[PDB]
Amino acid sequence: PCYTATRSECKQKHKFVPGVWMAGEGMDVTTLRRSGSFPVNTQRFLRPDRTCTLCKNSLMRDATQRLPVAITHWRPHSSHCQRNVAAAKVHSTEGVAREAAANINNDWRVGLDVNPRPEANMRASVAGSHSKVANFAAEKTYQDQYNFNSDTVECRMYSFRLVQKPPLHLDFKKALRALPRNFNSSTEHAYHRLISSYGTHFITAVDLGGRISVLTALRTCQLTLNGLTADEVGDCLNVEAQVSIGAQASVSSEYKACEEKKKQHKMATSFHQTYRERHVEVLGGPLDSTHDLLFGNQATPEQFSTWTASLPSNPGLVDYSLEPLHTLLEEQNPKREALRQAISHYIMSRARWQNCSRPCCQCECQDSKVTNQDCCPRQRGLAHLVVSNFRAEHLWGDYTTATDAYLKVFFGGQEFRTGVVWNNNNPRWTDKMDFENVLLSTGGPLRVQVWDADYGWDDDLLGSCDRSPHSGFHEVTCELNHGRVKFSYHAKCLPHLTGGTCLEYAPQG
Ligand SMILES: *[C@@H]1O[C@H](CO)[C@@H](O)[C@H](O)[C@H]1NC(C)=O
Ligand SMILES: [Ca+2]
Ligand SMILES: [Ca+2]
Ligand SMILES: [Ca+2]
């Protein structure tokens, strides 16, 4: 929307249109990072006719500015203001409780009386009682709270393009002079010398404007694990035997003996991980809005208004379009071909492992204690417990006959039973017992209980064993009151976890 000026119009101090020098800049296509290279020279401002293109400045007083020849169409977009405010909140909870109790009581008593007629008497009495109490309890609370939001403001003001015949810069010409004839393995290094110094693509169409971006994340993860165990045993025995004779002669023997035993086991475990990230980017502004805009979650509209009012003087970067470098060479020139091949390969190289920030090169999933949004481990302490190779040695279960024994597995509030072989004093079983995902840390103590099936309302207990689960291919041996029981298990940690009880996170992130 402007024209060519004349000799007198092209005399006084006339600054260039804002942000024009950003045009034609090289940019890596791999990283989308501005290396700061200018394959094209935009310094010239006079056509061979010696006139210059003064162009009026909308949204900037009522003056005119200089248009360089390489520029196609400087459109002063009147006004375009966009805002995008996105938010997201996620909550997750999980709560489990197991409780178990067992009460057992038994009593015994006998009484005998003999009264022979010819001057004789006799009495006897016996008593006894047993009691066992067991209590298991466990609580498991998981809660995760994730939060995200992003506020972006854009204001497009300027935009313009280039042609396919712009004046190439002298330094780029000198680089081309030292550049070899065509492509080869030895000369490819020389191409690298060009690439990092001039990028792979150059800006052909550009749009100028101001921008704010504010990203904020907040990831919190809380684990609480509680476990209680309480055992009581009480055994009271009472014997009282008295014998008297018709002639004065008395004997009395009274026994009393009662044992009490208590066991308590409490274990609390708490994990808390909070990660907060903010990130703010600003491209427009003459170092003036920086006074208040960068800091503080809220910006008052007044300094924002001052920023926008001063914005036309200094533009930023909002959008760009890329043109391959080989487009800029001569139409009849072989060294176009041998050029881009290398770049193409080069691109793919940095696409594979040299630069892998965007594809995830599958990365880790944890915040790594710095940057790296990723994820806290949604499950911790879980293991795939597998119990196998049940065997026992030298039992004494059945008194008259051979031992009829069977085992019970108690873990994490779960009650599990096996098959019973008959009449064996050292049997073993081929059961492949699996627990799927269980918490070893707060599953309580693994109990293996050896019972003797005597077909009665009061079964005979050969014994029991308590062990603390740990990760690895472990073997467990237990000596009973009579006989012994041996077996093994392998409760491997779930991935991203290791250690004895599978709580600590092995890698950095
Ligand atoms: C690569 O080929 C060019 C000519 O095509 C030659 O000048 C250069 O020496 C070669 N480099 C090698 C074979 O390493
Ligand atoms: Ca028995
Ligand atoms: Ca039995
Ligand atoms: Ca038997």
From Swiss-Prot:
Positions glycosylated per UniProt: 184, 355
CDD domains: C2_Perforin
InterPro entries listed in its UniProt record: C2_dom, C2_domain_sf, MACPF, MACPF_CS, Perforin-1_C2, Perforin-1_pore-forming
Domain comment (free text): Perforin consists of three domains: (1) the MACPF domain, which includes the central machinery of pore formation, (2) the EGF-like domain, which forms a 'shelf-like' assembly connecting the MACPF and C2 domains, and (3) the C2 domain, which mediates calcium-dependent binding to lipid membranes.
SMART domains: C2 (SM00239), MACPF (SM00457)
Binding, Ca(2+) 2: 398, 401-402, 404, 423, 436
Cofactor: Ca(2+)
GO molecular function, one term: pore-forming activity
Name the UniProt record assigns to this protein: Perforin-1
GO cellular component annotations of the record: cytolytic granule; cytoplasmic vesicle; cytosol; endosome lumen; extracellular region; immunological synapse; membrane; plasma membrane
Domain C2, residue spans: 364-482
Phenotype upon gene inactivation: Mice are viable and fertile, but die of virus infections that are normally efficiently dealt with by the immune system. They cannot eliminate lymphocytic choriomeningitis virus, but die of the infection. Young mice are abnormally susceptible to mouse hepatitis virus. Cytolytic activity towards tumor cells and transplants is also severely reduced.
Organism in which the protein naturally occurs: Mus musculus (Mouse)
Classification via SUPFAM superfamilies: C2 domain (Calcium/lipid-binding domain, CaLB)
Entry PTM: N-glycosylated. The glycosylation sites are facing the interior of the pore.
Gene for this chain: Prf1
Binding partners and assembly: Monomer, as soluble protein. Homooligomer; homooligomerizes to form a pore-forming ring.
UniProtKB keywords: Calcium, Cell membrane, Cytolysis, Disulfide bond, EGF-like domain, Endosome, Glycoprotein, Lysosome, Membrane, Metal-binding, Secreted, Signal, Transmembrane, Transmembrane beta strand
GO biological process: defense response to tumor cell; defense response to virus; granzyme-mediated programmed cell death signaling pathway; immune response to tumor cell; immunological synapse formation; killing of cells of another organism; positive regulation of killing of cells of another organism; protein homooligomerization
